[PDB]
Structures are given as C-alpha cells and as structure tokens.
Design an enzyme around this catalytic site. Sequence first.
Site, PDB file in Angstrom:
ATOM      1  N   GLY A  24      27.628  29.788  65.690  1.00  0.00           N
ATOM      2  CA  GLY A  24      26.370  30.366  65.250  1.00  0.00           C
ATOM      3  C   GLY A  24      26.083  31.759  65.769  1.00  0.00           C
ATOM      4  O   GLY A  24      25.030  32.325  65.439  1.00  0.00           O
TER       5      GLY A  24
ATOM      6  N   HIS B 263      31.403  37.282  55.795  1.00  0.00           N
ATOM      7  CA  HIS B 263      31.866  35.925  55.581  1.00  0.00           C
ATOM      8  C   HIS B 263      30.718  34.946  55.481  1.00  0.00           C
ATOM      9  O   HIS B 263      30.955  33.770  55.201  1.00  0.00           O
ATOM     10  CB  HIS B 263      32.909  35.476  56.614  1.00  0.00           C
ATOM     11  CG  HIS B 263      32.442  35.336  58.032  1.00  0.00           C
ATOM     12  ND1 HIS B 263      31.475  34.440  58.449  1.00  0.00           N
ATOM     13  CD2 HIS B 263      32.923  35.906  59.154  1.00  0.00           C
ATOM     14  CE1 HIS B 263      31.334  34.519  59.765  1.00  0.00           C
ATOM     15  NE2 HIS B 263      32.200  35.403  60.214  1.00  0.00           N
TER      16      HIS B 263
ATOM     17  N   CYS C 183      27.814  34.440  65.169  1.00  0.00           N
ATOM     18  CA  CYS C 183      28.245  35.532  64.286  1.00  0.00           C
ATOM     19  C   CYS C 183      27.082  36.443  63.937  1.00  0.00           C
ATOM     20  O   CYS C 183      25.953  35.996  63.692  1.00  0.00           O
ATOM     21  CB  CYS C 183      28.858  34.992  63.032  1.00  0.00           C
ATOM     22  SG  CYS C 183      30.364  34.089  63.327  1.00  0.00           S
TER      23      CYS C 183
HETATM   24  C1  LIG Z   1      33.223  29.447  69.141  1.00  0.00           C
HETATM   25  C2  LIG Z   1      32.693  30.530  68.242  1.00  0.00           C
HETATM   26  C3  LIG Z   1      32.585  31.844  68.672  1.00  0.00           C
HETATM   27  N1  LIG Z   1      32.127  32.843  67.912  1.00  0.00           N
HETATM   28  C4  LIG Z   1      31.748  32.547  66.659  1.00  0.00           C
HETATM   29  C5  LIG Z   1      31.808  31.272  66.121  1.00  0.00           C
HETATM   30  C6  LIG Z   1      31.314  30.991  64.737  1.00  0.00           C
HETATM   31  O1  LIG Z   1      30.222  30.490  64.583  1.00  0.00           O
HETATM   32  N2  LIG Z   1      32.094  31.318  63.685  1.00  0.00           N
HETATM   33  C7  LIG Z   1      33.357  32.047  63.751  1.00  0.00           C
HETATM   34  C8  LIG Z   1      34.419  31.305  62.970  1.00  0.00           C
HETATM   35  C9  LIG Z   1      34.476  29.814  63.317  1.00  0.00           C
HETATM   36  C10 LIG Z   1      33.457  29.140  62.370  1.00  0.00           C
HETATM   37  C11 LIG Z   1      32.827  30.287  61.584  1.00  0.00           C
HETATM   38  C12 LIG Z   1      31.677  30.956  62.332  1.00  0.00           C
HETATM   39  N3  LIG Z   1      33.996  31.257  61.516  1.00  0.00           N
HETATM   40  C13 LIG Z   1      35.093  31.044  60.479  1.00  0.00           C
HETATM   41  C14 LIG Z   1      36.019  32.224  60.385  1.00  0.00           C
HETATM   42  C15 LIG Z   1      37.391  32.033  60.229  1.00  0.00           C
HETATM   43  C16 LIG Z   1      38.257  33.110  60.180  1.00  0.00           C
HETATM   44  C17 LIG Z   1      37.771  34.403  60.288  1.00  0.00           C
HETATM   45  C18 LIG Z   1      36.421  34.570  60.440  1.00  0.00           C
HETATM   46  F1  LIG Z   1      35.927  35.830  60.475  1.00  0.00           F
HETATM   47  C19 LIG Z   1      35.535  33.523  60.494  1.00  0.00           C
HETATM   48  C20 LIG Z   1      34.457  30.726  59.177  1.00  0.00           C
HETATM   49  C21 LIG Z   1      33.607  31.470  58.415  1.00  0.00           C
HETATM   50  N4  LIG Z   1      33.292  30.716  57.364  1.00  0.00           N
HETATM   51  C22 LIG Z   1      32.368  31.001  56.277  1.00  0.00           C
HETATM   52  C23 LIG Z   1      31.045  30.273  56.451  1.00  0.00           C
HETATM   53  C24 LIG Z   1      30.388  30.463  57.797  1.00  0.00           C
HETATM   54  C25 LIG Z   1      30.004  31.730  58.336  1.00  0.00           C
HETATM   55  C26 LIG Z   1      29.352  31.626  59.548  1.00  0.00           C
HETATM   56  S1  LIG Z   1      29.215  29.973  60.022  1.00  0.00           S
HETATM   57  C27 LIG Z   1      30.015  29.440  58.624  1.00  0.00           C
HETATM   58  N5  LIG Z   1      33.924  29.510  57.438  1.00  0.00           N
HETATM   59  N6  LIG Z   1      34.623  29.534  58.541  1.00  0.00           N
HETATM   60  C28 LIG Z   1      32.295  30.262  66.941  1.00  0.00           C
END
Ligand code: A1IHV
Lengths: 302, 300
Positions: free
Chosen positions: A143, A41, A145
């Site tokens: 952040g 993603h 991920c």
């Molecule tokens: C509290 C917290 C705990 N652990 C991880 C985070 C965190 O950071 N993320 C997890 C979630 C929430 C924001 C983002 C990254 N994820 C969205 C998402 C939605 C549905 C399924 C999925 F698998 C990912 C997402 C991804 N994208 C693409 C651009 C991007 C990829 C990484 S940041 C942005 N847009 N929304 C947060």
Amino acid sequence: SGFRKMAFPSGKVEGCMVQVTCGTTTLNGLWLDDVVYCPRHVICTSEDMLNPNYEDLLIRKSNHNFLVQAGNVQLRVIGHSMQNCVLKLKVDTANPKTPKYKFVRIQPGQTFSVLACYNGSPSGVYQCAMRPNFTIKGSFLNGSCGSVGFNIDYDCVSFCYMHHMELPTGVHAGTDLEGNFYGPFVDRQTAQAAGTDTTITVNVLAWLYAAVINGDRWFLNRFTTTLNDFNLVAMKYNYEPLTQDHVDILGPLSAQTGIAVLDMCASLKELLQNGMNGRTILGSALLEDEFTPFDVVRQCSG
Amino acid sequence: SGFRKMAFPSGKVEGCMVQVTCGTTTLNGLWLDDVVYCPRHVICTNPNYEDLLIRKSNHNFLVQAGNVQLRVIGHSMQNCVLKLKVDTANPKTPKYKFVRIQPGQTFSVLACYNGSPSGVYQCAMRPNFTIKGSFLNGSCGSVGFNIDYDCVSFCYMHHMELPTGVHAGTDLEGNFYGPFVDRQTAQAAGTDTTITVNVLAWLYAAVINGDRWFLNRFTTTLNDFNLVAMKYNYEPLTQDHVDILGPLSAQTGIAVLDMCASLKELLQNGMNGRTILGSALLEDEFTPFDVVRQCSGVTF
Ligand SMILES: Cc1cncc(C(=O)N2C[C@H]3CC[C@@H](C2)N3[C@H](c2cccc(F)c2)c2cn(CCc3ccsc3)nn2)c1
C-alpha cells in the site's frame, strides 16, 4: 554535537498526499496545483502485470473511474495523461497547500527524505540514499506505492523519488516525478533483480570528516595515497570509484579540518584493512555511506 | 520490507514553532493557542529565575512566527519552562496533550534554529535520562513528540548539551528528565545502560525481515537471563516487558525467553562478523510498539 540520520521536516509534503483508487486498487498520489501524480500501475490488475500494455489499458478509462480523496474530500478528475511510468490526473480543485516545489532527478549517492504513506495518510519519515545500483534501502509495506522522496532547501521542496515496487532482495525501486525509473527496472512483473551493490565512497569520506569535526581522530594515520592506488584498493572492497569530482567536492571539509582528501583516503584504506577493533565512529561499528558532503556541512556546521 | 529509524510526520508541530528573543538570547518556542512555551533560561543574566523574571517586561520578549510578530501580553513560569501569553492564538494549533515519557520510550524530535524547523529524527529517552540527539547552538526549545491518531503528545523540550555530547531537557511542564538543572554548573551524564526490551523488539524486527541467523534451539528463564543482563549492563527484563513483547512472540513463533537465549549468546559470543538489520551493534532505540507499527502499517 551528535550525528543522526536527520530527515527534512515533512509538513510541506504531508499536505500533498492523497489517495487514488482505480477498481480494486488503492495507492498514494501527490497533489500539486491541479495535478495528482501517481504510479501508472494503479490502472493494472495483477494479471496485467506480466506484460501490461499501459496505452491500451489507459485509453479504456474514463475520468470518473479514478477516485481521488484528499482527507475526507473527494476530488473530481477532469483529465488524465501518462508521462513515462507516472499517471497525471488533472483534478477540478488546485491544492491550496501546494508548496514551492520542483522535480529533480538525482544521482547515485544522493540522499533524500521519504514520507511513507498508506491510503493517502502519512505514516512516518526517514532518510534514504540512492544506492549505486539505483535501488533504495527503504521501509515500505503493501500500500506504500506512490509515497515520495524529497529534499527541502530554503522552503523549496525538490521531489526526487516516487515509490513503485519492492525487489526480491527487500530493497526498493521507483521513479523520478517525470516517471523515469532509476536504474534498469520496469513496472512489470519480470525477473528483475538489484545489481550487486557497492559502498558510496565519497559519502564514507564525508562521514569520516564529520567524525573529526565532532572530535574523533583515532582512525587517522600518517600515510597518504595516490588517487589511483586508493581506487585499486577500494574496488577490492566493493567500494565505488572515487573521482576527481569527488575529491573537488570534499575540498571544503578538507580545508575546515586540515586533513587533505588523499590523506583521508589513506585512513579509509587502513580502516578497510583493519576493521574498527571494537571501536565506533559517530556511534557506528560499520562505515556509514548515506551522509553526503552536503549533508555533513548542513548538520555539523549549520 | 525494510526497517528504518522512522519519525512521526512533523507537520502538525512545524506549525507551532516560533522564534523567541530576549536580550542577547534567541531560541525556539512552542506556540499553542495563545501561549508560547520556551526554556526559562532565555531570561536575561547560580540564577534566581523568580527574581530575574520579575524584572522583565512583556516587551522584552520578541516572538516571531515566521515573519509575523506576536506581541506578548503576559508571562509566568512553570518549573523550568517559561509561558508567554501572546495576543494571537495559533490558528494552526493541533489537537495536543502534554505527557511525560518513561526511560526506554521513544519520540520524534523536530530540531529547530531561529524558530525555523530544520530536521526531524527519532530518539529514545535513555535510562540515564539523556538523549543522543543532534543539536547545535540555537537548538534550545526544540521539541519532542509522538502522534496518536490526530493527537500530538508533546513530551520533551531541549534545554542543554552535556559534556559527553548528549542532551538534556524537560517535559512541557518544565520538569527535567534526569538529575539536571538549568544553570552553568558541573553536570554530567550518568553511566548509561542498554534498553533490553527494545533490543528484543529489534531482534523480532530482524526476524520479520528475514534475518534469522541468531536464532537457536534454547530457551531460558527471567532470573537466569537477568543475571546475564546485569553482567552486560543491560536493564533488567521484567515480566511486564515480557507481556509487552507478547504480540511479536506470537507472530514469529519465538517466545521472549527463547529470544533471550539468542540475546544471551550474542552478548557472550558476539556476532562473528555478521550483521542484524544492517547493524554490527545491538540496537535499543526501537520499542515493541515501534516495531509493530512499522512492520504492520499505522498512519497519521
Ligand atoms: C512490500 C511492498 C513494498 N512496497 C510496495 C508494495 C506494494 O504495495 N506494491 C508493489 C508491488 C507488489 C504489489 C503491488 C503494490 N506491486 C505489483 C508490481 C509488480 C511489478 C512491478 C510493479 F511496479 C508493481 C503490482 C501492481 N499491480 C497493479 C495493481 C496494484 C497497484 C498497487 S496495489 C495493486 N499488481 N501488482 C509492497
């Protein structure tokens, strides 16, 4: 003596964490040999996340759209491919700090260490378990991920988890390093929710055996139980069924302590009925279910 | 979200752990530049260590860094720590300092066996100067540290287990934490107390993570609350503790004496079968800084 949630030393994984950037998005990647593994993603926008078509998004990317940074060093991407929900970026440099490793998909109840990472820099390490509902009760902020979960046996790192998302109940969902999610979850913004969780019975029993090893017997009783009667009671407390495999697995700890597995099941039954009455077991006032039979033997005996 | 007992990444310390053997004793040492630090009780044979060490020759000390042997070229004592000068400087030596920590402060422990690190966990220096660790035979010489940016601050080296199962050790300058000695005498942990400022920190962590049931409309005063603390064997809360929690008070809207009122009521009435951050006990091994760092991510 003592009994702590002990993580594996993280240095072998630390040397594999990198930062991956696509567009405005930055997350963590795992750099092994000449491949960087990260959540696919990374190629999505927030908009894309309702119904992302990953194949369509990825065919539009050039190698140079991916910025990978190892410490202060930029790595050059020379190819890319998608395996299930993980993106594999081929890079021009192999990681000279690559440990001996393997990819392993774990089952519910298994434990592992998590190296929480942000912007490719490790922040901390802690011990986790795969819950029966295929989530993990981690500690992850925006952040994180691409942070990974692992075990280390005889200097081989077994990678078993890569972090993708936080579910609405505050627990966490991710994949194995082949990109298959644990559980029914998807890398899509959908109304998905953790199933009702249960307690990992075999781990509770192992921890009770750990308590006896370290010298605490106050919760034992003179009763025994059949396996089926135990499960009939345990299910009433949202405990996972105990299988004959679980009974076999606990054989060694039974032998070491002199307490038959089904006698320890009788103790657990009474604990569920009575509570602890102001007492603790290994310092806890709740029954602990994130130590495995293997973990107990590793930390308590050697 | 989430809140876990989290240790610092241990890699920079792993690269310093070595095995030290003398006579029948084998334990862990810390190899920094061209010195290996370990407990002086590795010395052979009421001990008189300055005498026993006079007898030892450099070659009595076998030092193994993985499979390589480091040859000892010199030895000296600094309090209860032995310092072995070796012929090779550790190419993996991190930027580091020796610091002494205060009771109530936390650190990560890399637990080792035969100079081989096997686990890492987070601990607090108890008010009674012990730690509730997990150590088996062979763990002596395992070390505690914090990491600030790129700098490792070494603060603990394990020397012994006490009869209640808790652990005692020194700073890296060989000064004991607490009223302990390195000899087979009768020694016991003193009565411990609960680290009040850390319990308050963890309550703030709970609130940040959505656990708010223990909050109430009331506030209190230091003097009033400190009388409750003494009654429940809690450390006194000082004004400096209040100041340290300042950030969390500002971020959650719950002033420390507001939160003290919550804690008073938890101490007096219990949790009524409820839990906080998944515990049925009040947890006191997270500092204010630990909570801020984990609920607002810093990385090393
Ligand atoms: C509290 C917290 C705990 N652990 C991880 C985070 C965190 O950071 N993320 C997890 C979630 C929430 C924001 C983002 C990254 N994820 C969205 C998402 C939605 C549905 C399924 C999925 F698998 C990912 C997402 C991804 N994208 C693409 C651009 C991007 C990829 C990484 S940041 C942005 N847009 N929304 C947060």
